[PDB]
């Protein structure tokens, strides 16, 4: 039977529910063969070899075991509009807005999703191998860890999951007969190929659909090989699906980096931060701090799962096993710890390649040796005179977290690390000071709710979760507010930052990167108990921020809070929240809108 198609592993070695899931989907998708992944190095080398032979990956000979994938340019990013959550009731998924369409997610009915599924998956893996990836989100064991099984027809997804999650036989052994999240993925190009293949990279942009069915604990993704769409444990499972589980179960799943910072007297605090795409999470999470005697260590750079412990501390774990980082802009100067991490055992996707088999991208800040030339991510000889970047702007590296030279010693502790501060922020060229602190938990929640970031357009992205809410955002806001009624809660201090304020010539007012350690110092000491009151929150008192070692900073413009700007600001925040959240907007947030307007009117 099915057994005849198994080219690695044994159906009999699978827990029955895992076997049933495989059986059902192999019948449906009709793969030519089945490969049960073991997660071993030998399997990995095997799959990289096969991918090299097929044109899927090229070896980057400048490094130890690094590889490059070039994709079809139509498949290079998440597609929000093609990403949906399916529930019986729309309101469980997104609030019904007052006007317009929701910008807080995209719901699809059970009925409509069945019709989409049936138009896509039957026979989709014909001519291909279906891989079975058992994976753990969180340390193989932890109270806070969840397991999934991802079936995929993409060896690129396999090797990337090996890095981004704990994967293989040991997870199946830990899972036993427990529950798991059912993850089904196909690139959507059964053989014989019906359309042209670009760069040997199969995709089906026209039918691409990334679906989440929380009541069935299933994630079903079709048409795209790109990481956000195909690495189902990460955005789909560890943010979307998990956020809903978290609300139902008394925990949180957030688009937050977690770092541990130590001062020159040995006192160490963990901080979590939510920033949208392009706003600097990875840079902060593995910061090399400029301030002497301080240290930063990385727990995670993208996703945090957080739950109150028995003494009321909000404990975080990083459910990922690796870093899926934006490559362009990464340099020894801007993120030397990232450059160090990616020197070996790394898969890059859509970056440029030098003639000595090195990588390259905008902002790498590394002059080429004599005679060395660049091949762009489109496989063309490239020069800076061509009018297009050598690397796609959202090109990535996918690298083992264990390789970060400052990876925190508790990054895999099953008890998690206690969060003392939560930081929000984004790109705001005007009006928003470098840093401010919320006035209370409810105000902090409002600060998160109110986030906006420049992407020439400025968009709302509350809690940096806009594309990732697994359920109604008004109920997510209520869930966060409810933390303040948790018995003996030790609530983290909330801050909002802006590394990106500009002067009138568009130049940054703050140098950023490692110098952001000065901002962290301020937060660290605020957590320990000074401040200047303003209508938007506390800012540092005059001279409180440590500027020793910097050239001149225009502190007055950087911390400027204009009534005109903020009148406009709160008017925009009100309109957005009342319109988009509507009947689901918690009263506490209403009070905060009004309270800020009241405070601003007094200036
Ligand atoms: N001016 C300035 N630019 C910064 C700072 N931090 C990061 N950047 C720029 O922001 C860009 C993106 O940074 P990155 O660390 O990848 O952001 P991210 O939040 O990790 C993105 P994703 O969630 O997809 O991984 C990079 O080009 C980086 O150089 C900073 O303090 N100042
Ligand atoms: Mn990142
Ligand atoms: Mn992210």
Residues facing residue 273 across a β-bridge:
257, 423
Say how many Å lie between the CA of residue 591 and the centre of ligand 3: 31
Task: Give dist(CA 92, CA 107) in Å, integer.
Answer: 9
Neighbours of 257 (CB within 10 A): 27
Per the annotation, where are the binding residues for GTP?
Answer: 278-283, 396, 427, 513-516
* Max intra-chain CA distance, the chain: 77
Burial of 36 from C-beta contacts in 10 A (0-12 / 13-18 / 19+): buried
CATH fold of the domain at 251-321+407-601: Phosphoenolpyruvate Carboxykinase; domain 3 (3.90.228)
> Which of 592, 278, 261, 236 lies closest to 438 in space, CA to CA?
592
329 lines ligand 1 (CB under 6 A): yes
Backbone angles phi, psi at 207, to 5 degrees: -105, 15
Q: What is the DSSP string of 382-428?
A: E-TTSSS-SS-TT-EEEEEGGG-TTB-TTTT-TT-EEEEEEEEE---
Choosing from 77, 277, 278 the residue with most ligand 1 atoms within 8 A of its CB, the one to mutate for a pocket test is: 278
Q: What is the DSSP string of 145-162?
A: -EEEEEEES-HHHHHHHH
Measured CA distances, 514 to 282, 283, 292 (Å): 12, 9, 11
> Which of 78, 57, 31 lies closest to 156 in space, CA to CA?
57
Task: Give dist(CA 588, CA 566) in Å, integer.
Answer: 20
**In 3-state terms, what secondary structure has residue 252?**
strand
Q: Contacts from 444-448 at CB under 8 Å and sequence distance 24+?
A: 444/494, 445/477, 445/480, 445/481, 445/494, 445/588, 445/589, 445/592, 446/589, 446/592, 446/593, 446/596, 447/494, 447/496, 447/537, 448/274, 448/424, 448/480, 448/494
Domain ranges of the chain: 1-54+81-249, 57-76+323-404, 251-321+407-601
Question: Of the bound ligands, which one is closest to the alpha carbon of residue 506?
Answer: 1
Measured CA distances, 309 to 138, 242, 267, 314, 441 (Å): 17, 18, 21, 6, 18
Neighbours of 375 (CB within 10 A): 18
Contacts of 89 (CB under 8 A, 6+ apart): none
Backbone angles phi, psi at 23, to 5 degrees: -55, -55
425 lines ligand 1 (CB under 6 A): no
Q: What is the DSSP string of 496-539?
A: EE-S--B-TTS-BSS--GGGGHHHHHHHHHHHT--EEEETTEEE
Task: Give dist(CA 552, CA 549) in Å, integer.
Answer: 10
Task: Give dist(CA 88, CA 74) in Å, integer.
Answer: 32
**In 3-state terms, what secondary structure has residue 560?**
coil
Measured CA distances, 40 to 46, 158, 272 (Å): 10, 12, 33
- Residue showing tokens 């995929």: 152
The two domains 57-76+323-404 and 251-321+407-601 share their CATH topology (first three levels equal): no
Say how many Å lie between the CA of residue 302 and the centre of ligand 2: 6
Choosing from 277, 304, 329, 426 the residue with most ligand 1 atoms within 8 A of its CB, the one to mutate for a pocket test is: 329
260 touches 297 (CB < 8 A): yes
**Resolution number, Å:** 1.9
Method of structure determination: X-ray
Positions of E strands within 98-140: 107-108, 129-137
Cα radius of gyration rounded to whole Å, the chain: 24
| Residue with CA closest to ligand 1 atom 9 | 280
Say how many Å lie between the CA of residue 40 and the centre of ligand 3: 27
Say how many Å lie between the CA of residue 514 and the centre of ligand 1: 12
- Which CATH architecture best describes the domain 57-76+323-404? Beta Complex (2.170)
Rounded to the nearest 10 degrees, the angle between the axes of helix 473-481 and helix 441-449 is: 160
- Residue showing tokens 């609530």: 491
Q: What is the DSSP string of 286-304?
A: T----STT-EEEEEESS-E
**In 3-state terms, what secondary structure has residue 569?**
helix
277 lines ligand 1 (CB under 6 A): yes
318 lines ligand 1 (CB under 6 A): no
Give the alpha-carbon dihedral of 332, 335, 339, 340, to 10 degrees.
Answer: 100
Question: Of the bound ligands, which one is closest to the alpha carbon of residue 278?
Answer: 1
Task: Give dist(CA 197, CA 207) in Å, integer.
Answer: 16
Angle value at C-alpha 448, between 511 and 466, nearest 5 degrees: 95
Say how many Å lie between the CA of residue 519 and the centre of ligand 2: 20
- H helix intervals, 419-472: 441-449
Q: Contacts from 569-576 at CB under 8 Å and sequence distance 24+?
A: 569/431, 570/596, 570/597, 570/600, 572/452, 573/449, 573/450, 573/452, 576/460
279 belongs to the catalytic site = yes
Per the annotation, where are the binding residues for Mn(2+)?
Answer: 235, 255, 302
Structure tokens at 156: 């690129």
Q: What is the CATH number of domain 1-54+81-249?
A: 3.40.449.10
Per the annotation, where are the binding residues for substrate?
Answer: 78, 226-228, 277, 394-396
- 578 sits in which H/E element: helix 563-581
The dihedral through the CA atoms of 70, 395, 256, 418 has a sign that is positive
Q: 189, 203, 279, 398: which is the annotated catalytic residue?
A: 279
């Amino acid at each position: 039977n099915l057994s005849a198609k198994v080219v690695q592993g044994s159906l009999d070695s699978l827990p029955q529910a895992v076997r049933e899931f495989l059986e059902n989907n192999a019948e449906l998708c009709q793969p030519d063969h089945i490969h049960i992944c073991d997660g071993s190095e030998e399997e990995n080398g095997r799959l990289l070899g096969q991918m090299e032979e097929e044109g899927i990956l090229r070896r980057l000979k400048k490094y130890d075991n690094c590889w490059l994938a070039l994709t079809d340019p139509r498949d290079v990013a998440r597609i929000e509009s093609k990403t949906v959550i399916v529930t019986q009731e729309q309101r469980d998924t997104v609030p019904i807005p007052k006007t317009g369409l929701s910008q807080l997610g995209r719901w699809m009915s059970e009925e409509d999703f069945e019709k989409a599924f049936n138009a896509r998956f039957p026979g989709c893996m014909k001519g291909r191998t279906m891989y079975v990836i058992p994976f753990s989100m969180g340390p193989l064991g932890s109270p806070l860890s969840k397991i999934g099984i991802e079936l995929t027809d993409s060896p690129y997804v396999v090797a990337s999951m090996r890095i981004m999650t704990r994967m293989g036989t040991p997870v199946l052994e830990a899972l036993g007969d427990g529950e798991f999240v059912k993850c089904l993925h196909s690139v959507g190009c059964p053989l014989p190929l019906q359309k042209p293949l670009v760069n040997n990279w199969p995709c089906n942009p026209e039918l691409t659909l990334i679906a989440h069915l929380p009541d069935r604990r299933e994630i079903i993704s079709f048409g795209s090989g790109y990481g956000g769409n195909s690495l189902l444990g990460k955005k789909c499972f560890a943010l979307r699906m998990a956020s809903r589980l978290a609300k139902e179960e008394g925990w949180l799943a957030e688009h937050m980096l977690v770092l541990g910072i130590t001062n020159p007297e040995g006192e160490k605090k963990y901080l979590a931060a939510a920033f949208p795409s392009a706003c600097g999470k990875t840079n902060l999470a593995m910061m090399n701090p400029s301030l002497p005697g301080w240290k930063v260590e990385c727990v995670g750079d993208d996703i945090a799962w957080m739950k109150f412990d028995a003494q009321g501390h909000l404990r975080a774990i990083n459910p990922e096993n690796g870093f899926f980082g934006v490559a362009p802009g990464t340099s020894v100067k801007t993120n030397p710890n990232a450059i160090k991490t990616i020197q070996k055992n790394t898969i890059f996707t859509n970056v440029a390649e030098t003639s000595d088999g090195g990588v390259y991208w905008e902002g790498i800040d590394e002059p080429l040796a004599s005679g060395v030339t660049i091949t762009s991510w489109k496989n063309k000889e490239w020069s800076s005179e061509d009018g297009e970047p050598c690397a796609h702007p959202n090109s990535r590296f996918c690298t083992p977290a264990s390789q970060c030279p400052i990876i925190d010693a508790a990054w895999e502790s099953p008890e998690g690390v206690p969060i003392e501060g939560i930081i929000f922020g984004g790109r705001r060229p005007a009006g928003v000071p470098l840093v401010y602190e919320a006035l209370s938990w409810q105000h902090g929640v409002f600060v998160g709710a109110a986030m906006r970031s420049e992407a020439k357009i400025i968009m709302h992205d509350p809690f940096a979760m806009r594309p990732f809410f697994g359920y109604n955002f008004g109920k997510y806001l209520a869930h966060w507010l409810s933390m303040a009624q948790h018995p003996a809660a030790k609530l983290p201090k909330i801050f909002h930052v802006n590394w990106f304020r500009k002067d009138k010539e568009g130049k940054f007012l703050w140098p950023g990167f490692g110098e952001n350690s000065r901002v962290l110092e301020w937060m660290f000491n605020r957590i320990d108990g000074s401040t200047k009151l303003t209508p938007i929150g506390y800012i540092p008192k005059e001279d409180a921020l440590n500027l020793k070692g910097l050239g001149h900073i225009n502190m007055m413009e950087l911390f400027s809070i204009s009534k005109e700007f903020w009148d406009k600001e709160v008017e925009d925040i009100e309109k957005y929240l009342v319109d988009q959240v509507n009947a689901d907007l918690p009263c506490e947030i209403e009070r905060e809108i009004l309270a800020l307007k009241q405070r601003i009117s007094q200036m």
